[PDB]
């Protein structure tokens, strides 16, 4: 029960690596690789749109020009974390 279990675990864990090698040769990890970076850029390029969505050449820029900064100024991070801690309490 402690040696047979080791044998079974070893055989299964060495058996699961051969299929991993076959998938790597086929190249199934790339699809996950591209999806991560493209999603990062598809969100990394939305700031250009959102930061310039309220270009002012009515005056809702009054808040959005600082709401974007304020909610991302390491204050709403440690304050929402504190509120979540209070809720858990």
């Amino acid at each position: 029960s402690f040696f047979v279990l080791n044998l079974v675990l070893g055989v299964l864990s060495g058996e699961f690596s051969k299929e991993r090698e076959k998938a790597k040769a086929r190249g199934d990890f790339q699809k996950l690789r591209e999806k991560q970076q493209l999603e990062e850029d598809l969100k990394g390029y939305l700031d250009w749109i959102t930061q310039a969505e309220d270009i002012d050449p009515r005056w809702n820029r009054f808040c959005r020009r600082k709401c974007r900064a304020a909610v991302k100024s390491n204050v709403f991070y440690w304050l929402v974390i504190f509120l979540v801690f209070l809720n858990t309490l």
Partner: protein
């Protein structure tokens, strides 16, 4: 030898008395030739073997033989460059002592015709395209912001508004933004004898945009004496081929959209009425991403504004402090 000693240091004193002299005009090189055998200068410098299309501006109206000026770099020291007429007469002097330069050959055939080489191997004709010596650019190089697609089309030009603030709203002492509704792409100053200047003169090139596109040069070039990069929002540049031929040759910054798959949701985020042209959106972007990358000097493959605008900032942070 009192003749050489008396005037040897003439250039060693006149280039430092006016250490605060204001620079004007500009020079760009085409041929980089050393000065060990071609010194011919009271400066006694090593040479002018800097690079092709070197960055240096000259305004010191010296004699008609040579022009001592300034090289723009981390240090505000002085330099020296050959005169535009000096280069023209000497670019063939290096090939003047090239024995069989006209037509005869040295392949064991001596005495066929002999005679001095023909005058065609000189500046008598030189009619390839009448390319002049070193040309002039503004006090700094103009700025053209290509990408992500055809400018002025919703998403494309709105990518330029986001990065804009930065530059201008960050120096306010080196940036004088400006807009031009002028076709720079079909604009070239290699006119035969004279561009159109009149309006009703009834000539073959009267009703043309050449007259109204040359009128914006006075807004550039010498006008840049305030040391400002001068950006433009013209919807004309879509490839670094047409503009990088003439004297303008601005700095081209390419905003990189990485793989041409993330651009699909970037354009389709507005839903309907964004595919009037459709096809021209997603390969005009990749066209730029074909030409010699070298063309554009700054690639902007980066994430949210806080790091990509730094790339633009650091490019001009060393550039603005090097032009003085």
């Amino acid at each position: 030898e009192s003749a050489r000693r008396e005037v040897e240091s003439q250039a060693q004193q006149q280039l430092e008395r006016a250490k605060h002299k204001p620079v004007a005009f500009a020079v760009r090189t085409n041929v980089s030739y050393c000065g060990v055998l071609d010194e011919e200068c009271p400066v006694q410098g090593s040479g002018v073997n800097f690079e092709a299309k070197d960055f240096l501006h000259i305004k010191e109206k010296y004699s008609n033989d040579w022009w001592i000026g300034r090289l723009v770099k981390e240090g505000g020291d002085i330099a020296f460059i050959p005169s535009p007429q000096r280069l023209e007469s000497i670019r063939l002097k290096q090939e003047q002592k090239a024995r069989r330069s006209g037509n005869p050959s040295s392949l064991s055939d001596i005495g066929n015709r002999r005679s001095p080489p023909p005058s065609l191997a000189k500046q008598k004709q030189k009619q390839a395209e009448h390319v002049p010596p070193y040309d002039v650019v503004p006090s700094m190089r103009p700025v053209v912001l290509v990408g992500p697609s055809l400018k002025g089309y919703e998403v494309t030009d709105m990518m330029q508004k986001a990065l804009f603030d930065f530059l201008k709203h960050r120096f306010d002492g080196r940036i004088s933004i400006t807009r031009v509704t002028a076709d720079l792409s079909l604009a070239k100053r290699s006119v035969l004898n004279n561009p159109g200047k009149r309006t009703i003169i009834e000539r073959s090139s009267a009703r043309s945009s050449i007259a109204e596109v040359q009128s914006e040069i006075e807004r550039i070039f010498e006008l840049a004496k305030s040391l400002q990069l001068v950006v433009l929002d013209a919807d004309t540049i879509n490839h670094p081929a047409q503009l990088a031929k003439t004297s303008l040759a601005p700095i081209i910054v390419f905003v990189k959209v990485s793989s041409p798959k993330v651009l699909q949701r970037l354009i389709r985020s507005r839903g309907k009425s964004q595919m009037k042209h459709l096809t021209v959106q997603m390969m005009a972007y990749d066209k730029l991403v074909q030409c010699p990358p070298e063309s554009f000097d700054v690639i902007l493959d980066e994430n949210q504004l806080e790091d990509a605008c730094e790339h633009l900032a650091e490019y001009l942070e060393v550039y603005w402090r090097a032009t003085h």
